[PDB]
Amino acid sequence: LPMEGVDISPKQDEGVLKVIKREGTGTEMPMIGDRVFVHYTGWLLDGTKFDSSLDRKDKFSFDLGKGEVIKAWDIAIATMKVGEVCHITCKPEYAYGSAGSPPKIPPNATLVFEVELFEFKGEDLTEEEDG
């Protein structure tokens, strides 16, 4: 239900909002091209849970800043520290726009995600939380 956070969109048009729920440790944030490992839960503004990696056997991974994930994610994950838990509000322009993604995402939908950054694999260094 709530759309909260700092506007972190490069154009500064409130397209991507972020709230840190748990501060991460370290100082390093993943770079463009780094492989990032997260756990997430995604909800529509009406509180409807459309997807969660927690329901699966391992973390969700992809290469940062390569357009493999919605724009909002490439923006938001680049601002995360390892061990950080945040809430991201994604406006449709930074998500699935007017088309949506049937059947779980309707047209012009604002998405809410709770994301935890577990690890990132850089060119020379890998950074992860303990476990």
Ligand SMILES: CN(C)c1cccc2c(S(=O)(=O)N3CCCC[C@H]3C(=O)N[C@@H](CCc3ccccc3)C(=O)N[C@@H](CCCNC(=N)N)C(=O)O)cccc12
């Ligand atoms: C394909 N279908 C059925 C879905 C599978 C899985 C998740 C889906 C989600 S989700 O839960 O909101 N999700 C996962 C992580 C958070 C972001 C978001 C996401 O992003 N996903 C990717 C697809 C990931 C995937 C995972 C497993 C199997 C297949 C696909 C996605 O859409 N990429 C877009 C990006 C276009 C970016 N242009 C641009 N100009 N930067 C695409 O390349 O077309 C929502 C809707 C469909 C989901």
